[PDB]
Amino acid sequence: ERPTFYRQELNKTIWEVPERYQNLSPVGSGAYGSVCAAFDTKTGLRVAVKKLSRPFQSIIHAKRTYRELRLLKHMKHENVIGLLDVFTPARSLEEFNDVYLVTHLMGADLNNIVKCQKLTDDHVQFLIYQILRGLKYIHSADIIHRDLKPSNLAVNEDCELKILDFVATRWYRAPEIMLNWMHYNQTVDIWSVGCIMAELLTGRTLFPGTDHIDQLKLILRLVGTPGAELLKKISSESARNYIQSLTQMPKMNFANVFIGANPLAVDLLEKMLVLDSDKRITAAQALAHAYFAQYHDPDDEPVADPYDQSFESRDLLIDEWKSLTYDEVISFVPPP
Numbered sequence: 055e056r057p058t059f060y061r062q063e064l065n066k067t068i069w070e071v072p073e074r075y076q077n078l079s080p081v082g083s084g085a086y087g088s089v090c091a092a093f094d095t096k097t098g099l100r101v102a103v104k105k106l107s108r109p110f111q112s113i114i115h116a117k118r119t120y121r122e123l124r125l126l127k128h129m130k131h132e133n134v135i136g137l138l139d140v141f142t143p144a145r146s147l148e149e150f151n152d153v154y155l156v157t158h159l160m161g162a163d164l165n166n167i168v169k170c171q172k173l174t175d176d177h178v179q180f181l182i183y184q185i186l187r188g189l190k191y192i193h194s195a196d197i198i199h200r201d202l203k204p205s206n207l208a209v210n211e212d213c214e215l216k217i218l219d220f221v222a223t224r225w226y227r228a229p230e231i232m233l234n235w236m237h238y239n240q241t242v243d244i245w246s247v248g249c250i251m252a253e254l255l256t257g258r259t260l261f262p263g264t265d266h267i268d269q270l271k272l273i274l275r276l277v278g279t280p281g282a283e284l285l286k287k288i289s290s291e292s293a294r295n296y297i298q299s300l301t302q303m304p305k306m307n308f309a310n311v312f313i314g315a316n317p318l319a320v321d322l323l324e325k326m327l328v329l330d331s332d333k334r335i336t337a338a339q340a341l342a343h344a345y346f347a348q349y350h351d352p353d354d355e356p357v358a359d360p361y362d363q364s365f366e367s368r369d370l371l372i373d374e375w376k377s378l379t380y381d382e383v384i385s386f387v388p389p390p
């Protein structure tokens with residue numbers, strides 16, 4: 055049945071967890087929750103435990119908590135962060151106030167590595183391959199990450215990588231988002247991967263915009279201003295007006311700009327950093343690119359089971375979201 059919990063204070067934050075998790079030590083605190091590293095006595099593993107912050111403070115938080123838990127329960131893939139456990143010290147629904155999440159402890163993030171070292175081409179291949187392999191899986195479930203950036207990619211000393219949260223976010227954001235298009239597709243993530251890869255190859259942020267306008271200017275400076283086919287797809291009169299009012303600029307030659315890099319890496323960047331999102335390479339297609347010949351195995355790049363996102367369009371009471379979250383905590387089945 056229920057296990058025994060113990061209590062402690064870590065950085066002005068209260069942590070009430072089962073006895074199986076020991077030696078809690080803070081790893082960091084996000085705007086959405088705090089994280090502690092710990093030892094899982096039952097498995098002999100190092101784990102990271104995240105305590106959600108104010109999970110049911112409002113309808114927005116409640117829905118976000120539910121979303122997070124449903125997503126995490128669904129993700130089962132080597133390159134996507136998954137759930138080893140989820141628990142609450144509450145014995146019933148009426149006293150339900152806190153949600154704790156548990157996953158494999160990861161030593162660092164990709165931002166921590168690119169700052170210290172400049173990666174070899176072999177490392178760039180394996181890291182990007184892993185990102186795409188994870189993204190193929192996520193995209194197959196009709197999910198869009200939307201916020202890929204180095205700091206959201208967890209990496210261990212072994213160069214194994216996992217996508218988390220599914221250096222300014224803005225720098226890795228697709229241009230169509232800077233234009234406020236409300237019908238962007240899963241290819242916004244491919245754009246972010248392009249930005250991440252370029253940075254791994256050159257050691258420098260590809261588009262360090264200071265605001266949305268500047269960000270767009272830096273982008274068009276590299277890939278050129280929109281051609282006629284892309285202009286026809288812009289419904290926003292003001293955005294269309296703005297873009298056409300800019301001084302036209304030609305697409306730069308990627309081979310010149312990234313000269314020194316492996317020509318295959320360059321070819322791929324060019325397929326990812328396409329201005330028109332309908333023409334960007336998909337994660338599945340990218341995995342087959344010759345740049346990943348040493349890693350690509352079509353029989354081991356799985357797709358996800360269907361993911362029901364219908365709850366996203368629902369308008370429920372806080373207690374309803376809280377109760378749905380509770381059922382999801384109770385029905386959780388740990389991995390093998």
Ligand SMILES: CN1CCN(c2cc(-c3ccncc3)c(-c3ccc4ccccc4c3)nn2)CC1
Pocket residue numbers: 058073074076095096
């Ligand atoms: C109130 N009693 C029972 C609960 N307590 C526990 C339980 C465990 C435990 C852990 C995992 N599964 C079941 C029970 C442990 C425990 C069990 C094993 C451990 C191994 C290495 C280091 C610390 C360890 C702590 N300690 N107190 C305190 C005394």
Ligand SMILES: CN1CCN(c2cc(-c3ccncc3)c(-c3ccc4ccccc4c3)nn2)CC1
Pocket residue numbers: 081084089102103104126135136137155156157158159160161163205206208218219
């Ligand atoms: C700037 N980045 C830094 C790292 N971030 C993280 C890291 C982790 C983490 C840390 C260490 N090992 C594994 C993961 C987590 C984290 C920590 C614990 C988790 C438990 C269950 C499910 C997901 C979890 C995610 N969140 N943001 C986001 C902000």
Ligand SMILES: Fc1ccc(-c2n[nH]cc2-c2ccncc2)cc1
Pocket residue numbers: 229230233235280284287288289290293297329330331332
């Ligand atoms: F300047 C730009 C930058 C990006 C785009 C863009 N790429 N893919 C889709 C779009 C787009 C942007 C706005 N509205 C529809 C489509 C269009 C113009």
Ligand SMILES: [Cl-]
Pocket residue numbers: 081082083084087088089
């Ligand atoms: Cl954090």
